[PDB]
Amino acid sequence: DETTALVCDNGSGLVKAGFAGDDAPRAVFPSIVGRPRHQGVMVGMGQKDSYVGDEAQSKRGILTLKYPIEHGIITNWDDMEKIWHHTFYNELRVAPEEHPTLLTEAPLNPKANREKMTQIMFETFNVPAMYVAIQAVLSLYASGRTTGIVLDSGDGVTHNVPIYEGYALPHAIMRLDLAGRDLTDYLMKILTERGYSFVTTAEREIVRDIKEKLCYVALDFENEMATAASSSSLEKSYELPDGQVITIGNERFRCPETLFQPSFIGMESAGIHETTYNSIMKCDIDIRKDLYANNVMSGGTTMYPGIADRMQKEITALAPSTMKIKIIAPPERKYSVWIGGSILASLSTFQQMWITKQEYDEAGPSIVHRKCF
Amino acid sequence: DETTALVCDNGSGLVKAGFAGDDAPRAVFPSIVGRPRHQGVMVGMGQKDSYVGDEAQSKRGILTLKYPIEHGIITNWDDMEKIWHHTFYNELRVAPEEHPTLLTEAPLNPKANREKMTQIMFETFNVPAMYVAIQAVLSLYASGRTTGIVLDSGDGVTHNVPIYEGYALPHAIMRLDLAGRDLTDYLMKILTERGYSFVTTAEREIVRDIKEKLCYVALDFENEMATAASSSSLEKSYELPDGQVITIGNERFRCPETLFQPSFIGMESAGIHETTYNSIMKCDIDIRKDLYANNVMSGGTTMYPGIADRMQKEITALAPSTMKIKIIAPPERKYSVWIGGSILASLSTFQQMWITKQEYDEAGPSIVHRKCF
Amino acid sequence: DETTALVCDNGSGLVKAGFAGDDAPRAVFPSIVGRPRHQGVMVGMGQKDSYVGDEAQSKRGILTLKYPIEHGIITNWDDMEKIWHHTFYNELRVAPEEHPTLLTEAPLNPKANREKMTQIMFETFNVPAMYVAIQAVLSLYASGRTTGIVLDSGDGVTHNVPIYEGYALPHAIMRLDLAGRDLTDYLMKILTERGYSFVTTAEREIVRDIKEKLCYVALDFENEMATAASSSSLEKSYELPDGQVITIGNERFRCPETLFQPSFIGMESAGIHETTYNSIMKCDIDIRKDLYANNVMSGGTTMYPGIADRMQKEITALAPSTMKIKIIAPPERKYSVWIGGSILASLSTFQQMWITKQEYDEAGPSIVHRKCF
Amino acid sequence: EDGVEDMTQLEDLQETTVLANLKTRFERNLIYTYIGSILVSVNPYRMFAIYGPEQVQQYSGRALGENPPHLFAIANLAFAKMLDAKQNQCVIISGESGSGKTEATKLILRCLAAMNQRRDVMQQIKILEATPLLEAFGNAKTVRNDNSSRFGKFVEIFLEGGVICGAITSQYLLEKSRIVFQAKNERNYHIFYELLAGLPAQLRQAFSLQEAETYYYLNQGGNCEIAGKSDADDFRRLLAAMEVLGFTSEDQDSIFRILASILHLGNVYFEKHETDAQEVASVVSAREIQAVAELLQVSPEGLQKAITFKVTETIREKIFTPLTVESAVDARDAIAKVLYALLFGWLITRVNALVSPKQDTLSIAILDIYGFEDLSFNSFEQLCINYANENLQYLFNKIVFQEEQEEYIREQMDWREIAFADNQPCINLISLKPYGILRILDDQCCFPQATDHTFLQKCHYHHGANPLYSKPKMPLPEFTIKHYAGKVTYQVHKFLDKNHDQVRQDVLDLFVHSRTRVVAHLFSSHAAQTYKAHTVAAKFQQSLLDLVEKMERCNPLFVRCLKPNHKKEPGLFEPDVMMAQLRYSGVLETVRIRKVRLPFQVFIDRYRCLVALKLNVPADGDMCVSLLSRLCTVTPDMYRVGISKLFLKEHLHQLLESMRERVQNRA
Ligand SMILES: Nc1ncnc2c1ncn2[C@@H]1O[C@H](COP(=O)(O)OP(=O)(O)O)[C@@H](O)[C@H]1O
Ligand SMILES: Nc1ncnc2c1ncn2[C@@H]1O[C@H](COP(=O)(O)OP(=O)(O)O)[C@@H](O)[C@H]1O
Ligand SMILES: Nc1ncnc2c1ncn2[C@@H]1O[C@H](COP(=O)(O)OP(=O)(O)O)[C@@H](O)[C@H]1O
Ligand SMILES: Nc1ncnc2c1ncn2[C@@H]1O[C@H](COP(=O)(O)OP(=O)(O)O)[C@@H](O)[C@H]1O
Ligand SMILES: [Mg+2]
Ligand SMILES: [Mg+2]
Ligand SMILES: [Mg+2]
Ligand SMILES: [Mg+2]
């Protein structure tokens, strides 16, 4: 009885799912639940009271966009259940009671989150078996490596996990709540300097698209600020969905710099380079050599052009001058975690590490804290 | 028990009624109540002291024409009751106590108007059920669409209502009190430049007929004024009901231009193109695209030859240069609202949105503010 | 050489100016530029083609009122220059080239606004020195405090600024575009329910006067709606400038409730209480205690009788049940910002924080972004 | 020989037992079974000239208790009941296509004609000659049958004082969607292909009919030669009968002209051509519409403006409206459908008028009706067929419950209190006024910016909680309705194109002023005879209501027909095919009506080994059940002790079986 196990990377801002053994996610759509707010006047078109991610993307102008997952933790459980039901039935058209499912999670997430996730996916969808895997180990699986620090930076969380030859160092795991959504909010707040006002949720997503299509990270900040406010070479234009053209100057690269300077939002934490260096310096010396030599990336918010060069420069400035820093920036930073999950779920030696229905029924939901990580 | 519901579009200057399910109004006649003013000398012919619209049309010379509906609001209630009684009994020959009735209304009309309309149509005619629908949603129903801005311009009101996929935007509804009757008054006041004097009500309606049969809207105003006062190509002749021939020059197109330049009457408001553009710019961007692409028309006073081309030119000059403006000008601008009402009243899913007699009797007339719009 | 510095609070709808060291603004007049629209017939009385605020107030019936400042940002620069020239010469009768001037601004305003303001006030009036100060810090100065959140709600903008012991938290500044002018527009749109039509600019200002003289904010909305539509105790009468008496019912308190329920205008944002609570919850815990204990108000549009009690009730319902919320509502909510500016401009330690003419001439207008805030 | 004519008397009633009984009787060369009021017939594929005129006297009603179950007993039963209760009634012939319904109709007509010794003298009353003609007009090839009745044939035989008068024929539920649309591996009505195959040359050069294989109304099936058993000889015999009916050659020529006009209208295409402010429509080739106009005696510009422009006409003005491509296609399809329906009505009216009987006379009804259909994929036509069969099954269940109630009352008075659950919820789910499925479809027809997906979503919303409705799990364009015959899954693909039967008044006015006399007369009669609606579903519902009213005017008693394996094998069949046909006919519902009851003397006799059961009981009313009930502590599931002891329940039967099996384990 051959049954491919589903791999459902339900990230913080995008849901990436598919079957195990493929090379790319079958379905990719934002994790948004939309509800209309105005009053319906045409008799008959007042029945669809909830639009899942892509449909709610198509109809931004007459409804409100709410993200069920805020900064990693699942806030609204009903919306997340709706998203899971949609991605199981209306998107893959595969009954979830005949396929095992794999789910991902941030490292330092609360425990009630896992307990409720297991309860929902065992009682509602009646999945035969499920598993919860940290995203960094899946990123390392997908990178085809066994050593190095994973810098997984989605739009809800940014965490480092040092691994050496398969043995994780759980006392060096660092997690930051600064991610892509906060970059989008800073871009919204910094675009007002030129007069563009974005307040609604649809305008917030327009700003998100602007960030994806225009923003980049510079090597040096003072030099690039001088260049921007010394000419018009860095200015680029964007077209809003009503044909209105906007122009962006030094705001192009001052949006993603807050990753290295989180004092712009007012956070007391340090940049991603500093957290990576501190996580290395929480590990053993023999570990430290290979952690220096094998930095790896993942997550969407690390796709800014020029991120690798600057973080290499910063680590080299921080690390001792005689060591070799080599930062891996594969062109699949997006959904590398899903590729790793698909590799992991296709292993025949993984068949014994599921969470069978009998186990959950006999020992209760607490076994998700025992069989994971 | 099959009972077709009556649809009675009691507009501001013309009453258009009929049964639901037809394709054209059964009865069309002006909404005028006429009363004789001279002294009767023949014994016996002094009994008919009130002539309803068409009879008062036939006998203009010995009576005064009063419109019960002035600028949308119902001023004289007894005259309107007489018109309703006539159009129910002497025109359709259908008892109103056996058929539901549908009525239309301007968007921003007062509330006592609706309360009194419901009270009269429930207490006098004893209609089993009635409903009040905004004219713009019925225009969209008749146009076979679900998006776009309706420019409903009768002879008492000119209002815009933006709708996107059945969800109205009530904060972008704009209403102007400049309509066809004010165009007729301006034509009366502007015809005196050539010596023709029209003062009485019958002469006012002769001027209305002149406006209907001769007036048009030009693409450019200065060029057409120069052409008119540079030749006699635009001059046309009309024959008054006594065989007296009149000639009209540049007054032919300077009567309906006040729709785009309402400063001629002295109003501080802006033209219909400007109000449509401002109503669009009060909506969301994703809404704005489809509102640009799907402008629609209705009402009698939009039947001037050349209105669509000029308003397209003006919107294109106002809107960003990269968007596509497409103005729908169906050949049923007159009584498109009635066609939409007939479509709406024939739906079997509409049966539950009436205002039953029990509901009105138990909760009072205030429910017309709850079940409408 | 003793020279008192002028303090010119050029708000969004009213200009409040005077000398530093006084206790009340010397001059208060609306910021309106009026231009006649009809045709002059008397030879000689066709020369005054522009009336500044108070003169244009006196002659509303023959001219159009345009506000140069729309929603905080300065739209028409020539009209604002005319207003500044008037308030310097024809109102205070003080040459502006011998006195330093202080100006106020919204927090999140564009930067070209500041650059052009400095350029105009240095090149045209040749002021020796000028400064641009945020309105919330001046409100805190006038309240005689150093902690708390300022809710400055003029007629163009409504913004919160949390300050603790003089250290502002710039990442918790929230700004809403819902202000008094939008309340006036909603009152205009909601008065049509009783038949009163106000379309022109003079009628808009009559509605503004109605709002100032009659509107109030209730503690509970459903209870007060039931009371209003259960009796005639809340009905009040107003006399238009032609002796015509109007009566207002539940529209009296449904105009200023949109501050707490901005969905009436269709905005997706939340009420002022919700924005204040969210701004608090963007601050540190030790900050949060004193921000809870020291809420303060300013701006004209917070003078509605009953605003303090309702916003106290709402914050208490939002905040944890064990904390003490104390909302400061001094009787100088109007021109509290000017009192704070006068206090700030009279300090002898402030003499070194001006923007001298030499500094602007040597470094250009960009220093207004460096020496402000 | 093996009679088992009444299976009510057996120990228990199951579909397996009924199937075994029918198999045994079929192996005994017995076709008809007399199940009380109801009769069951099976197609034997075997030419049985049962007796001759003697069978009427041999199988009359005087010895129904001993007479073999036969089809012709109802012939005498009808007369016996009408001479006693003084009330005429109706007889329906129901069953799937190919189940010998036409053969049964012919047999019953022959028996009714042969019972009065007069048909030999007045055989000139020309009754059954046109049955093949109405068959060619009303039958078409289905994926499961080459001869399927697609209309509710109704023949009314009139009687006055024992004298057989003339007959009146009518159609009720013709499916107009077949003319323009047809599924795969099926085809249009047989007469179009018969005309194209038997077409003489003079029609080939005169009428442009050289594209017989490329007409859009015909090539939709994809293979029109599967019916190769039919040929031009069918056309020749159809013409022979057509001339026999007294029709002149002019009528036949006009009929062929109308059919050719319909076929030519099938081959008309439109182009999305630009216009003033939109892109609306434009006729591709005008030579075809011109040829249509030439052979229809009507202006060509009239057809252009009736299929391209929409006319909104008021008293003071008449406004022309450009139409979209889909609207033009719908108008053309409506024109074709109304023309075909008018032709059928005209021919039926003329046939009835030729042999019109006396008025205000007695009348017996014969109704040829559809069969329950469940294909691999189901469409609108199957939904309408299932709705009609649901109404007829409701009537049949009412009859069965009436028979059960009268039997119960005949036994004892006080069992009239027994209730019964009908299929009314299914009828409401299909066509209830507020939120019926057909009502939702009618609303979606006129609703702006509608598609199949929106209609499916609305059906899913309004019927989510209905137990009979079954939302598919996957996002599939289907839904499932629980009929009495089982679950049926329909497909919502192309419903909106099967309902736009909108014919504006301008088209009728254009066709009234035609130069030819037949078309003008037909349209004038249609306008004169004409509240209504403008969808295929609404007209189908109106016709179904008329048929139901006509049936309830009389007393319903009918007969079902079944079919063996469709490979035309005489005397051989599959039990699974029997189960399917039994489920589709509806006779299985009789078991549900039984809800059980057995004689008590039989229990006394054959249960002589139950606790040494004493057999010396001569009284059926003696106390024997409560004696075991209280001594053995049998739960008192029985509501009350009867006299005949027909209070048996299934739980008691199971308890008795359990006792029998446990007691038998002695050694
Ligand atoms: N090409 C890109 N450039 C910059 N940012 C991107 C790009 N693609 C995605 N992002 C950002 O990554 C965030 C989430 O991406 P991803 O990591 O794929 O999903 P998740 O965070 O749910 O794992 C989005 O909020 C988006 O702003
Ligand atoms: N063909 C036409 N050309 C110009 N104006 C017209 C025409 N037909 C009607 N009107 C104007 O439209 C006004 C009212 O028409 P209509 O909208 O049909 O009624 P209502 O305004 O009551 O809905 C009349 O006052 C008339 O002046
Ligand atoms: N007593 C009052 N009650 C209600 N509203 C008021 C009152 N006084 C002023 N306002 C409103 O405050 C707005 C502006 O007042 P203010 O804040 O003093 O000027 P600015 O907004 O320019 O700082 C006006 O539009 C007016 O509607
Ligand atoms: N009871 C019967 N006895 C003898 N022959 C029969 C009987 N029933 C049907 N047949 C034969 O079976 C053949 C199949 O006809 P069929 O396709 O059932 O016609 P229809 O579908 O119009 O009823 C007929 O030619 C008929 O002669
Ligand atoms: Mg991720
Ligand atoms: Mg109108
Ligand atoms: Mg202020
Ligand atoms: Mg047949």
Which CATH number belongs to the domain containing residue B220 in this structure? 3.90.640.10
CB D132 within 8 A of CB D147: no
Identify the closest residue of chain C to A186 by CA–CA distance: C171
Write out the H or E segment, with its range, that includes residue B263: none
Q: Is the CB of D48 under 6 A from ligand 4?
A: yes
Within 10 angstroms of residue B246's Cβ, the number of other Cβ atoms is 15
Instruction: Identify the residue whose tokens are 């430049």.
Output: B193
User: Annotated catalytic, D417?
Assistant: no
Range of the domain at A140: 134-179+269-330
Whether chains A and C touch (3+ CB pairs under 8 A) is answered by yes
Cα separation, A145 vs B308, whole angstroms: 67
Nearest CA, atom 4, ligand 3? C212
| A85 contact residues in D (CB cutoff 8 A) | none
CB C176 within 8 A of CB C260: no
Q: Ligand 3 pocket: which of C31, C150, C212 to mutate (most atoms <8 Å of CB)?
A: C212
Cα separation, A159 vs A153, whole angstroms: 7
Cα separation, D26 vs D69, whole angstroms: 13
Cα separation, C182 vs C259, whole angstroms: 10
Name the catalytic one among D41, D60, D102, D363.
Answer: D102
Cα separation, B224 vs C164, whole angstroms: 68
Q: Give me the residue from C73, C169, C269 closest to A266, CB to CB.
A: C169
Measured in angstroms, the CA of A249 and the nearest CA of chain C are apart by 13
Q: Is D474–A93 a contact, with Cβ atoms under 8 angstroms apart?
A: yes
* CA-only gyration radius of chain C, Å: 22
* Per-residue tokens: D67: 């007479």
A82 and A146 belong to one structural domain = no
Pick the closest to residue C251 from C228, C276, C233, C274 (CA basis).
Answer: C228
Cα separation, D97 vs D85, whole angstroms: 34
DSSP letter at A15 equals E
Cα separation, B80 vs B349, whole angstroms: 31
Residues of A with CB under 8 A from a CB of C: 37-38, 64, 189, 192-195, 197, 199-201, 265-266
**Three-state DSSP state, B183:** helix
C27 and C55 belong to one structural domain = no
Whether chains C and D touch (3+ CB pairs under 8 A) is answered by no
User: Cα separations (Å) of A25 from A5, A97, A144, B145?
Assistant: 13, 20, 18, 37
DSSP letter at D500 equals B
Interface of D with B in 315-344 (CB under 8 A): 315-316, 319-321
Cα separation, C218 vs C225, whole angstroms: 10
Chains that touch B (3 or more CB pairs under 8 A): A, C, D
Q: Which of A41, A42, A47 is best to mutate for the D interface (most D CBs within 10 A)?
A: A47
Q: What are phi and psi of A38, to 5 degrees?
A: -80, -170
CB C21 within 8 A of CB C342: yes
User: Cα separations (Å) of C170 from A190, B235, C337?
Assistant: 12, 70, 19
**Three-state DSSP state, A337:** helix
Collect contacts of C240-243 with beta carbons under 8 A, ≥24 apart.
C240/C206, C241/C206
| Domain D386-491: CATH architecture, name and number where available | Up-down Bundle (1.20)
Q: What is the DSSP string of D389-403?
A: HHHHHHHHHHHHHHH
Give the end of a domain, one of B66, B86, B120.
Answer: B66
Cα separation, D110 vs D123, whole angstroms: 11
Q: Give me the residue from B328, B343, B346 closest to D277, CB to CB.
A: B328
Cα separation, D422 vs D420, whole angstroms: 6
Please calculate the CA angle B84-B89-B90 and round it to the nearest 5 degrees. 100
Q: Which amino acid is at A87?
A: T
Q: Which of A190, A199, A200 is best to mutate for the C interface (most C CBs within 10 A)?
A: A199
Q: Give the resolution value in Å.
A: 3.6
C206 and C161 belong to one structural domain = no
Cα separation, B102 vs B106, whole angstroms: 14
CB A120 within 8 A of CB A127: no
B234 conformational bin, left if phi > 0, alpha if psi -120 to 50, beta if neither: alpha
**Residue B334 CA to ligand 6 centre (angstroms):** 7
Cα separation, C51 vs C73, whole angstroms: 22
Collect contacts of D268-274 with beta carbons under 8 A, ≥24 apart.
D268/D307, D268/D332, D270/D325, D270/D328, D270/D329, D272/D325
Experimental method: cryo-EM
Cα separation, C272 vs C279, whole angstroms: 10
User: Annotated catalytic, D431?
Assistant: no
Asked if D439 is an interface residue toward chain A (Cβ–Cβ < 8 A), one would say no
User: Annotated catalytic, D102?
Assistant: yes
A245-248 and A174-176 beta bridge pairing? unpaired
Write out the H or E segment, with its range, that includes residue D36: none
User: Cα separations (Å) of B8 from A176, B99, B100, B133?
Assistant: 66, 12, 10, 11
Q: Look at chain C and count its residues.
A: 373
Cα separation, B216 vs B260, whole angstroms: 13
User: Annotated catalytic, D626?
Assistant: no
User: Annotated catalytic, D162?
Assistant: no
Cα separation, B149 vs A350, whole angstroms: 59
Identify the closest residue of chain A to C111 by CA–CA distance: A193
Cα separation, D471 vs A89, whole angstroms: 13
D29 conformational bin, left if phi > 0, alpha if psi -120 to 50, beta if neither: left
**Residue D496 CA to ligand 3 centre (angstroms):** 59
Which CATH number is B47's domain given?
2.30.36.70
| B108 contact residues in C (CB cutoff 8 A) | 189, 192
Instruction: Identify the residue whose tokens are 């109205």.
Output: B168
C88 and C170 belong to one structural domain = no
Q: Is the CB of B303 under 6 A from ligand 2?
A: yes
B292 and B250 belong to one structural domain = no
C222 and C287 belong to one structural domain = no
User: Cα separations (Å) of A122 from A4, A358, A372?
Assistant: 18, 11, 16
Measured in angstroms, the CA of C351 and the nearest CA of chain B are apart by 46
Pick the closest to residue B340 from D323, D320, D448 (CA basis).
Answer: D448
Asked if D532 is an interface residue toward chain A (Cβ–Cβ < 8 A), one would say no
Measured in angstroms, the CA of A194 and the nearest CA of chain C are apart by 5
Which CATH number is B274's domain given?
3.30.420.40
B13 and B55 belong to one structural domain = no
Write out the H or E segment, with its range, that includes residue B298: strand B295-298
As for how many domains chain B has, the answer is 4
B26 and B105 belong to one structural domain = yes
| A201 contact residues in C (CB cutoff 8 A) | 268
Rounded to the nearest angstrom, the gap between the alpha carbon of residue A278 and the centroid of all alpha carbons in its chain is: 22
Cα separation, B177 vs D37, whole angstroms: 76
D228 assigned to a ligand binding site? no
Cα separation, B117 vs D411, whole angstroms: 65
B14-19 and B27-30 beta bridge pairing? antiparallel
**Three-state DSSP state, B163:** strand
C90 and C162 belong to one structural domain = no
Write out the H or E segment, with its range, that includes residue A344: helix A336-346
C194 and C314 belong to one structural domain = no
Cα separation, D374 vs A236, whole angstroms: 63
Pick the closest to residue A224 from A196, A192, A256 (CA basis).
Answer: A256
Across D152-181, b (16+ Cβ under 10 Å) vs e yields bbbbbbbbeeeebbbbbbbbbbbbbbbbbb
B77 and B153 belong to one structural domain = no
Q: Is the CB of D563 under 6 A from ligand 4?
A: no
Give the end of a domain, one of C236, C265, C294.
Answer: C265
B316 and B199 belong to one structural domain = no
- Measured from the alpha carbon of residue D44, the closest ligand is 4
Q: Ligand 4 pocket: which of D103, D229, D561 to mutate (most atoms <8 Å of CB)?
A: D103
User: Annotated catalytic, D261?
Assistant: no
User: Annotated catalytic, D148?
Assistant: yes
